[model samples]
Target: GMKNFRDLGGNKTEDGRTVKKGLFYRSAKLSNLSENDIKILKELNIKYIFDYRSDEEARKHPSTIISNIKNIRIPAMRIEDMIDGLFEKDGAFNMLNNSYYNLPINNPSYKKLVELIRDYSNLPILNHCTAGKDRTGVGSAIILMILGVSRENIMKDYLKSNDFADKEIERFIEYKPKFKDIPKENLKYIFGVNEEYMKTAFRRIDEEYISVEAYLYGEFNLNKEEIRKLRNQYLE
Candidate 1:
């Protein structure tokens, strides 16, 4: 079971109403969830589980199996064959890291994700990636933005992971100074959220597709009524 799964609900919306709790949650991968964790999950009454990991990641660390819960695995991008090129010598980690920092609004997968969010039923939905921070962070930010939450609050929600992740890293360091050799400062960049990253994504959204609304209406083919349905389903 994840010790850090959280509900992003309860923030006041633009019109002063708070998002409803028990509607949405974000968490780390369920690959290592214990049997007790499974019981807790069943108790939470989650109806949908969205996995954002690639197929390989999923295969290697399969999600927790739960009877009757709908499981949807959608890879944010195709990274199957490019594993070596991504991590070996081309600084793939940096490339991927930078993309995670900036690609949400511009990537086609993100556009697809918006559609998925719009179409989700009015049931408790949980979405996650491996660490529930990068892809999941961007996903949560987009949903919060659509719900009319303030940008500052959305960023606060994203950066909350830093406190959790840092504590975990420290617990596992075992006084191996070499593990600490890789500057912890970069952990701030990787684990903590930054407004600049989100701003860049929004800027790219404007440059490429005008506004998120326009992208939804034009690219995703969501009509006025559909957009209204989405807002009603997700927003308070």
Candidate 2:
């Protein structure tokens, strides 16, 4: 029932090439994954993993692993991290759609995220957060955008996390008796993957630069020279 687990392959890049299957994947925390799940992932020849969860969240649910995979931590700010820390006196999240604006590339980990993706000799890599929608969504989108995936498909790709995580979504709804006065509906937006969120991110991308390339260069510092390395790794 976890909503954050998914494969990000098969979608065509704008240049008529599909993302190299099995080489890339996205998901939520690996903490709850079963033995069967671990074996299945191993079949992809995975040797690199990125966990975007904050330290405390990860501690409560430490991931399991087998041989070969070198799991790395790259923390990104997540709303739940706020929930875990913020006193109830603080206001709740508003304009959650804007939560993702400029976040895909603005974090301190952005450089290393690209560096790993660029020179990753490891055939398959999985990156994740507590829920794969926000950080992982933008993370996956970064690779796709750099590879020239169209905006339409990127939004389509971003929306799929909610589907993959459908069972988990309900579980999240059911699990919230812990917070009585808070509306389950309020949590709905928190535990979701929505087009509007992606729209806001892309809109910000446009406002900041003429194109994704400019944004990458300006923020991640990935210029033409650096990008060719990405093309060599991610494309046909």
Candidate 3:
């Protein structure tokens, strides 16, 4: 099974509603999806697959073409740019956090994501990046926040990516063997999800727009009606 694939469902809002199951999912790259994985995707009836990988990343690791499902490519940020200082001390942490500081602000990829979800017929959507962590993480976080999911619940969903740490670390080593000399702890910053990393994102978003709800309105131009539409579509 793909280590990082999950349906972002059954998560609760602050008011006690639940995110409907199977309408949304988050996962790692689809380039290596197995036959059974494809079958599972078909069964889920996901209408769109949002690719948040950079041009270089997608060209190098293009997804397997599945019938009927439309693939939407929106490069979140260049992985090369994010890992530019991979070897420096605390480099991975700083780089990842820095990306989050700007990820929720005026980013086209995330903007389109919110716009799409506002339209009820556009689901079920499956969004992903390389490890289904950073870019995809923020994207998922924003959606949850817009749906009125509480911080604790959003954090719970974000931290779930850590469950695939071993698999991610091993895969990273294989993908870039030269980086094998880097300590496992450091690699975790690059490949694994941390509470602080996401906290930094929420903190940045809140600091800039006063709150995540306001940030959604300011950044994506999402008015209250659009947010309500999202909650209606995703929450039960």
Candidate 2 local lDDT, 1-236, one digit each (tens): 23356666777876677766777788877876677887887787887888787889888988886688898887866445544533344423434555677576467655567777776675578888877888888888887877778889988888777665556546654776555455444554566666777877788888889988899898777898777667666676
RMSD of 2: 4.2
Clash counts per candidate, in order, are 0, 2, 0
Worst 10 residues of 3 by lDDT: 78-87
Candidate 3 has which clashing residue pairs, if any? Answer: none
Q: Please provide TM-scores, in order, for all candidate models, with all chains considered together.
A: 0.80, 0.82, 0.88
Name the lDDT of candidate 3. 0.83
Worst 10 residues of 2 by lDDT: 85-94
lDDT of each: 0.69, 0.72, 0.83
Top-down lDDT ranking: 3, 2, 1
Candidate 1 regions exceeding 4 Å error are: 79-97, 105-116, 119-122, 181-183
For all the candidates, what are their Cα RMSDs to the real structure?
4.6, 4.2, 3.1
Question: How far is 34's C-alpha from truth in model 3 (Å)?
Answer: 2.2
For TM-score, candidate 1 versus 3, the one ahead is 3
Q: Give candidate 2 misplaced runs (Cα > 4 Å).
A: 1-3, 78-95, 176-188, 225-229
Maximum-lDDT candidate: 3
| Candidate 3 C-alpha error for residue 105, in Å | 0.3
